[PDB]
C-alpha cells in the first residue's frame, strides 16, 4: 500500500502564531496525466466529523480561510496555519487519493495559554450509591493549565493508588484550560471503616499541593 506519515504527533502554540506540520508518503502522489498531487488535508475538531480543508496539495476548499496553506509536491507535504486562533485546536489528517485512499496517523494541535491552578472540589459517596453496596469518592480538578498534573489520595493520612481512575477533558476551546476527574472507588465496608478522606493536586503553579478533605465525624 501507499503509507502516510505525519510529524510531529503533537504540538502546542499560542494564539496569533503560525504552525507547520509535515506529511510524507511512501510513493509519489503526482498524477502526471493531470499534473496534480492527490493529497488532501482534513481538520477534525474533538467530537466532530472530519472536514476537508485542502485538496490537490494547495487548493483550498470553498470557504476555508486563507490562513490555512497547503504546499509540497511528490512525497513531501506541508500544512501551514497562519495566526492560529483558539478555535483551530483539532487533529489534522493528511489523506492520499492517488491510489484508493489512506489517511496518516494525525497531528494534534493544542492552544497555549498562561498557567493556571486547578479549582479542586471533593465529594463523598452519595447515600444513594451507598445503598447499592458501592462507594466512590470523587475529586474534580477544574480549569487548569498546563495538562500535566498529579493527584494523590489519602485515607486517614495514608496514600491509596489502587481503585483510582483519572479522566481529562479535551482542551477547552473557549478558555483553553483542561479539567480532570479523579474517582476513588472502594467497597462500602472499607469506606465506613475510615474517617478522613483527602485528595491533593500537585500542579506546577505552586510547590504547595491544593488539598480538599472531608471527615465523616463532622
Amino acid at each position: 500500500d501507499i503509507v502516510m506519515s505525519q510529524s510531529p504527533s503533537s504540538l502546542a502554540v499560542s494564539a496569533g502564531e503560525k504552525v507547520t506540520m509535515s506529511c510524507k508518503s511512501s510513493q509519489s502522489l503526482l498524477n502526471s496525466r493531470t499534473r496534480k498531487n492527490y493529497l488532501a488535508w482534513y481538520q477534525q475538531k474533538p467530537g466532530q466529523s472530519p472536514k476537508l480543508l485542502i485538496y490537490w496539495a494547495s487548493t483550498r476548499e470553498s470557504g476555508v480561510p486563507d490562513r490555512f496553506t497547503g504546499s509540497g509536491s511528490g512525497t513531501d507535504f506541508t500544512l501551514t496555519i497562519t495566526s492560529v486562533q483558539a478555535e483551530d485546536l483539532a487533529v489534522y489528517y493528511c489523506k492520499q487519493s492517488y491510489n484508493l485512499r489512506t489517511f496518516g496517523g494525525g497531528t494534534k494541535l493544542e492552544i497555549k495559554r498562561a498557567d493556571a491552578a486547578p479549582t479542586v472540589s471533593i465529594f463523598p459517596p452519595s447515600s444513594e450509591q451507598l445503598t447499592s453496596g458501592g462507594a466512590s469518592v470523587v475529586c474534580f480538578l477544574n480549569n487548569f493549565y498546563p495538562k500535566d498534573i498529579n493527584v494523590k489520595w489519602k485515607i486517614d493520612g495514608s496514600e491509596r493508588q489502587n481503585g483510582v481512575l483519572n479522566s481529562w477533558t479535551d482542551q477547552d476551546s473557549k478558555d483553553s484550560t483542561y479539567s480532570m476527574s479523579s474517582t476513588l472507588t472502594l467497597t462500602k465496608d472499607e469506606y465506613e471503616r475510615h474517617n478522613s478522606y483527602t485528595c491533593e493536586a500537585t500542579h506546577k503553579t505552586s510547590t504547595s499541593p491544593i488539598v480538599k478533605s472531608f471527615n465523616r465525624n463532622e
Partner: protein, 223 residues
C-alpha cells in the same frame, strides 16, 4: 442542502454481522463515488472502501484490513449507501462515517455524515446508575459552588449529560467515560453562584439512547 445520514449502528457480539446505512439527499447520488471511513475511540481515521459512480459501473474497492470481510453496495433508486460488515471483531469498534467522494479530476465540495457508533463486545446493553454529588454535610458556602453527577455502570456509549435541561451550560465539565468492570463510568461537574443553589434547583439530565433511558437527578443538600 446536501445531507448524509448514517444509521444502523449499535452493539453486536464478536463474530456477528451488521449492516450500516447512509441515506443521502440534495445531489444526484448516481454521479458520485461514496466512501466509508472509520475511527476507533481515541485513534486515527481509517479509510475502508468506496463504490464508484454510474459512469464507472458502481465497482468496489476496499482497504486490505477489511477486504473479503466488508461489502459496500448502493440502492440507486432510494439514494442509499450500505456497508455490510461480516465476521466482526473487537477492533471494528468505531465510529463509521459515510463520505461523498470522486476521482479528483473535477473539483467537488466534500460532504461527510455525522457518523454511527458500532460496538463489538460480549457485554450487554445496560442502563446507567445516576448518583448526585452534593458537597459534604460539613462543607461551608462561599462565592461559587460546584455540584456533580456520577454516571456509573452503563453500556455501550454514548451518554450525554446536561444540567437544568440545557439552561446551565456554562461552567459545565463532562469527563470522558472509562471502562470499569467492562461497564462505562463518567462524571460531570457544574459550578454556579452560591446564591443560586440550593435556593434554586440544579438537576442533571442523563440520556442513554441505547437503553432508551433518560434520568433526571436533582442535586439536594445532604442531611
Amino acid at each position: 442542502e446536501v445531507k448524509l445520514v448514517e444509521s444502523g449502528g449499535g452493539l453486536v457480539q464478536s463474530g456477528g454481522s451488521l449492516r450500516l446505512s447512509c441515506a443521502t439527499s440534495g445531489f444526484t447520488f448516481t454521479d458520485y463515488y461514496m466512501s466509508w471511513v472509520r475511527q476507533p475511540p481515541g485513534k486515527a481515521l481509517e479509510w475502508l472502501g468506496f463504490i464508484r459512480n454510474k459512469a464507472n459501473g458502481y465497482t468496489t474497492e476496499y482497504s486490505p484490513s477489511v477486504k473479503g470481510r466488508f461489502t459496500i453496495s448502493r440502492d440507486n433508486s432510494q439514494s442509499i449507501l450500505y456497508l455490510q460488515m461480516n465476521t466482526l471483531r473487537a477492533e471494528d469498534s468505531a465510529t463509521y462515517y459515510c463520505a461523498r467522494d470522486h476521482d479528483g479530476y473535477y473539483e467537488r465540495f466534500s460532504y461527510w455524515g455525522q457518523g454511527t457508533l458500532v460496538t463489538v463486545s460480549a457485554a450487554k446493553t445496560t442502563p446507567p446508575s445516576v448518583y448526585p454529588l452534593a458537597p459534604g454535610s460539613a462543607a461551608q458556602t462561599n462565592s461559587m459552588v460546584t455540584l456533580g453527577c456520577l454516571v456509573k455502570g452503563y453500556f455501550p456509549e454514548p451518554v450525554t449529560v446536561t444540567w437544568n435541561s440545557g439552561s446551565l451550560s456554562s461552567g459545565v465539565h463532562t469527563f470522558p467515560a472509562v471502562l470499569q468492570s467492562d461497564l462505562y463510568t463518567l462524571s460531570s461537574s457544574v459550578t454556579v453562584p452560591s446564591s443560586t443553589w440550593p435556593s434554586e434547583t440544579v438537576t442533571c439530565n442523563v440520556a442513554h439512547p441505547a437503553s432508551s433511558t433518560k434520568v433526571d437527578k436533582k442535586i439536594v443538600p445532604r442531611a
